[PDB]
Design a binder for these strands. Structure first.
Lengths: 282, 225, 156, 259
RNA sequence: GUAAAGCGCACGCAGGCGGUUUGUUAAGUCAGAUGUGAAAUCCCCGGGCUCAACCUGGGAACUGCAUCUGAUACUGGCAAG
RNA sequence: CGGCCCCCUGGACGAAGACUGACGCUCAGGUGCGAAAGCGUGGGGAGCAAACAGGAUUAGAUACCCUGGUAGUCCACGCCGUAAACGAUGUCGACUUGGAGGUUGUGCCCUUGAGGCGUGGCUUCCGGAGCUAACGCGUUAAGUCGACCGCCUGGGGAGUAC
């Protein structure tokens, strides 16, 4: 009855009736113990719901505070250790060990959905090693992207990216005084190297202008079969905008771009002319 | 948020006489002017700001605030403040054991609600006159006592008070239960039971109003957050 | 998980115009076998109701105690009104050497090994209170280190 | 910082104790209590009867400013002694102004000698006078049109006891209490005295330079015992009283009010 | 204080205690050593009676006393403040 | 210890300075002072009044009440050495939040007024922490400590017997 008299804060009830029914509950810190009251003497009230509408795996989690503690609580009854986060779609990446994953995951299509609605969003059960594997797959990439940011010499870049946390991808908004501690910081130049990275971002925006900032192809040319986005940009760079404009161009006119060959330009022109001529038929 | 000049204008710096003070308030006192204690605004302001911040934080997590003043000078104002931010209040005499003995008072609330319903929603009229007068009187009594806290449900998560010495019963209840207390504490008052003390003139009306208004604004902010 | 011991129950009287009205007081204590402990002192016209009340009261207003493994952290004295109490940490195996109400509170507290004498009054209520006081005031090594601005190894 | 210390001494510099600085803005009126705020610890519980002028209706709305009086602090909660006393200082200043030119000119209308001297009233208050002062000569305003309008020309003032006698007519014409306590003595000299505190057996009207009178309970009215002084006269009001009796030794001047 | 228990009040010998700084001494104090503190008994580790009690080897202990050699913070003595 | 005066005389406190330089605190035995009653010798003797007498009251009234009334109370010099001789609280020192007074100094301040701001001594009441069986005590401790002494160990028998 505690819940009825506002003593057991019950938010969502992400449960799958007919199988497992795990749900977390909060409470105003006043020696109440929410799960305890929900369970009772040796699961007294717990047994009631267990054989209530049918054999269900009902579970109660002691809600801690905010959504961060809801993640682990949604992995119960099991053993969570860590989890990743993001923005709108944070996607709670469950981080457990294979040995404990057997019970944590329980069933492929059961605890993966019951704990998915627990937080209301969705969870991505992973492994302790998996986390590290993906973790590194992130350090190299603010670097693993053909280094399209600042750029100067490479021998200094290796020694700079050794100490550099999270590469340089938009790192100017972070502390601009700890890289000056690095052995070698005279006039503001590294504080300037980061500025170069910012300029690289603007250069990337200029590349977007090269692919949009200067009028990229229409939906007819972009959705044409046999052509990619780079090929459509290379074809549209010669003044064409639509698929009909690409059909108006010839093999010799498209031969000015080295990315397209004579046979490929002929096939693209024939496909555009067929789409223009047979456009009456679906 | 609240400036010092404004507080001075209100009359916060004024505090009780020099025969009626409390030596635990000695830190918060600055000097004694015409045999009247002056509260040190330098030390008051930062803590008032703190208290405001805490209140805001409480609001952000959907905390329930209770506004207590039964001085009968600033009863109107405390009610107004409570309503502005749609929070709860006790502007008339605090019932002994309102919080500690909630479960009993909860029945009281329920009876009041039922009576209100009868009055308004039923539209049944046709009641024996004396009986009708008695029911009306009961309604008035219960409205006066428990009007603000009727929609409260359970126990507040924080307690703002206008006078510590005057509302010591409420303070003691909050301490027993562990509810955070945010008290305006004049020189005569005892601030030991208070968690977030506020040295200010509980008596003067304008000062009380100022205190209330800033508190209400920060509650509204936390709600918005 | 909590264990509860009714220490004592005592009949008390109130004289009225008719005669004597009798009632019963129940002194109980509860604990989780760890630091946490709480006593309750209930009263009712009938015994079971009074003990029920004692249990209820004990369950609230509990108090924590810093236990080094099964015993105490140092000899500690505690008093209340007449009952003055000494209790001393002791080696594993010795058990609870203590008399009466005091014993009971120690057991629920989850102390297993103590040497303990109740000087002065042995009025169960007062002596249990005194025990609780001695347990509360008792501080731990980490606590004293924190108090004093040092490490634990400095204090040993 | 010292900002605050400098302000504290500034605010000292910009207030004084008595009712001098007209500072309290009337911030709530209801009948029968006016309230102000003169930069004091609390607001004054003002009577309405300090603030109605000469015919019985109020004169100041919200925001209006009159100083009150001080040097008494917190009977348990609150702040002041009333503001009309402040008006007494203004009346004293007007009376003193005479000295400069040896003639204070107002309206003074004295119909009858309370205690030997015609009573002269200035705009709101009415003061009592010694005999000679009502008339410059034996003219005797009893034959003048009742409550006539001339002026007040000062004949006599007691200079510690507020007894001031003034000359209504004839525009052309132009320790300490207890040794010689025989001035208001003879049998029946009536006085205008403000009552101070009613002790449930008394009223304690006492005005005339640091003395104490008692009109206790027996006269006060024309009922003897069921009277309870607080019901029948006032608190803090100037009344009809006369001596009836003096001790110069055991300092008990036993005034009366049934007269 | 009211349960038993503050002399009715003082002065004051003996006695007890004694502000602060420096120097000195080394009585108290502390440290180390030597001598002794019988054996048995007690306690520790062992051994022997089938076990045990009992017997029994070695240790520890016997908290002390006396001396010698140091230490000098404290207490004391002496000298100056 | 209480009407004024005078003579001889002890202590206390404050104000500044100057000096001495631990000379101090406590104290078993010891010594002194010690209400009232009481004793001795000699004086005195108004009033009051143990004892006593009478009148009442009463069942009785060796009392209470009334009418009288002697020791004594008063003085001198001795003795007695006890009292709920009580703050039922040993003395000395140090330290710990406050308020309202009284009394007696004293410094400064325009005493511009009986006042304003301090700073000492003694003292009454209330009350905080703490203490206390509780009552209460609470900077004059019954709080927190030190030095010395006195005293207590169930009630009666008994503060009696020898």
């Amino acid at each position: 009855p505690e819940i009825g008299e506002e003593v057991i804060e019950i938010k969502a009830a992400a449960r799958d009736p007919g199988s497992r029914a795990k749900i977390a509950v909060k409470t105003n810190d006043k020696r109440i113990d929410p799960v305890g009251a929900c369970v009772g003497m040796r699961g007294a009230r717990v047994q009631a719901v267990s054989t209530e509408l049918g054999g269900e795996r009902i579970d109660i989690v002691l809600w801690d505070d905010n959504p961060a503690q809801f993640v682990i609580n949604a992995m119960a009854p099991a053993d969570v250790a860590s989890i990743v986060v993001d923005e709108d779609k944070h996607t709670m990446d469950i981080a457990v060990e294979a040995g404990n994953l057997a019970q944590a995951i329980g069933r492929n299509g059961q605890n993966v959905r019951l704990a998915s609605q627990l937080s209301g969003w969705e969870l991505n059960v992973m492994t302790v090693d998996d986390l590290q594997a993906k973790h590194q797959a992130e350090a190299h990439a603010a670097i693993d992207t053909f280094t399209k940011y600042l750029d100067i010499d490479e021998d200094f870049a290796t020694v700079l990216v050794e100490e550099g946390f999270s590469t340089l991808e938009e790192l100017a908004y972070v502390p601009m005084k700890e890289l000056l501690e690095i052995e070698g910081l005279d006039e503001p130049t590294v504080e300037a190297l980061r500025e170069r990275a910012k300029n690289a971002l603007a250069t990337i925006a200029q590349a977007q202008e090269e692919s949009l900032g200067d009028n990229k192809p229409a939906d007819d040319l972009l959705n044409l079969e046999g052509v990619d986005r780079d090929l459509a940009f290379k074809l549209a760079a010669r003044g064409v905008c639509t698929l009909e404009d690409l059909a108006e161009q010839g093999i010799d006119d498209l031969a000015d771009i080295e990315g397209l060959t004579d046979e490929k330009a002929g096939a693209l022109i024939m496909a555009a002319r067929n789409i223009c001529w047979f456009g009456d038929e679906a | 948020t609240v400036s010092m000049r404004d507080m001075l204008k209100a009359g916060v710096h004024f505090g009780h006489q020099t025969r009626y003070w409390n030596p635990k308030m000695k830190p918060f006192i600055f000097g004694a002017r015409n045999k009247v204690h002056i509260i040190n605004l330098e030390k008051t302001v930062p803590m008032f700001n703190e208290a405001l911040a805490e209140l805001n934080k409480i609001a952000s997590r959907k905390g329930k605030i209770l506004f207590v003043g039964t001085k009968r000078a600033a009863s109107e104002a405390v009610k107004d403040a409570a309503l502005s931010c749609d929070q709860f209040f006790v502007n008339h005499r605090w019932l002994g054991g309102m919080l500690t003995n909630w479960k009993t008072v909860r029945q009281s609330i329920k009876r009041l609600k039922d009576l209100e319903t009868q009055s308004q929603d039923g539209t049944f009229d046709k009641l024996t006159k004396k009986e009708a007068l008695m029911r009306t009187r009961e309604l008035e009594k219960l409205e006066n006592s428990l009007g603000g806290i009727k929609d409260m449900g359970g126990l507040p998560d924080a307690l703002f008070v206008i006078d510590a010495d005057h509302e010591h019963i409420a303070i003691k209840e909050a301490n027993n239960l562990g509810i955070p207390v945010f008290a305006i504490v004049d020189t005569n008052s005892d601030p030991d039971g208070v968690d977030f003390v506020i040295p200010g003139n509980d008596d003067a009306i304008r000062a009380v109003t100022l205190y209330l208004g800033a508190v209400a604004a920060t509650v509204r902010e936390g709600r918005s957050q | 998980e909590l264990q509860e011991k009714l220490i004592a129950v005592n009949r008390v009287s109130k004289t009225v115009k008719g005669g004597r009205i009798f009632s019963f007081t129940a002194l109980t204590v509860v604990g989780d076998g760890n630091g946490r402990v709480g006593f309750g002192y209930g009263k009712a016209r009938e015994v079971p109701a009074a003990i029920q009340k004692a249990m209820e009261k004990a369950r609230r207003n509990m108090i924590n105690v810093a236990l080094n493994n099964g015993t105490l952290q140092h000899p500690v004295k505690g008093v209340h009104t007449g009952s003055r109490v000494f209790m001393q940490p002791a080696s594993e195996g010795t058990g609870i050497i203590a008399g009466g109400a005091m014993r009971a509170v120690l057991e629920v507290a989850g102390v297993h090994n103590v040497l303990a004498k109740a000087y002065g009054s042995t009025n169960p209520i007062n002596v249990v209170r005194a025990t609780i006081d001695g347990l509360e005031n008792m501080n731990s090594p980490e606590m004293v280190a924190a108090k004093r601005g040092k490490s634990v190894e400095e204090i040993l | 910082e010292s900002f605050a210390q400098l302000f504290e001494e500034s605010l000292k510099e910009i207030e004084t104790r008595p009712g001098s600085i007209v500072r309290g803005v009337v911030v709530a009126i209801d009948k029968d209590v006016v309230l102000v705020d003169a930069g004091l610890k609390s607001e004054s519980a003002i009577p309405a009867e300090q603030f109605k002028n000469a015919q019985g209706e109020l004169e100041i709305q919200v925001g209006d400013e009159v100083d009150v009086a001080l040097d008494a602090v917190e009977d348990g909660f609150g702040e002041t002694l009333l503001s009309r006393e402040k008006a007494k200082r203004h009346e004293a200043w007007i009376t003193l102004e005479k000295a400069y030119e040896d003639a204070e000119t107002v309206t003074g209308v004295i119909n009858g000698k309370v205690k030997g001297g015609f009573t002269v009233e200035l705009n709101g208050i009415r003061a009592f006078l010694p005999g000679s002062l009502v008339d410059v000569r034996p003219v005797r305003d009893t034959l003048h049109l009742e409550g006539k309008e001339l002026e007040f020309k000062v004949i006599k003032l007691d200079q510690k006891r507020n007894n001031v006698v003034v000359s209504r007519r004839a525009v052309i014409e132009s320790e300490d209490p207890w040794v010689a306590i025989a001035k208001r003595y003879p049998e029946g000299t009536k006085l205008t005295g403000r009552v101070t505190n009613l002790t449930d057996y008394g009223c304690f009207v006492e005005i005339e330079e640091g003395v104490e009178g008692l009109v206790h309970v027996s006269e006060m009215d024309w009922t003897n015992k069921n009277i309870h002084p607080s019901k029948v006269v006032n608190v803090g009001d100037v009344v009809e009283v006369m001596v009836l009796d003096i001790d110069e030794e055991r300092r008990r001047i036993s005034l009366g009010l049934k007269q």
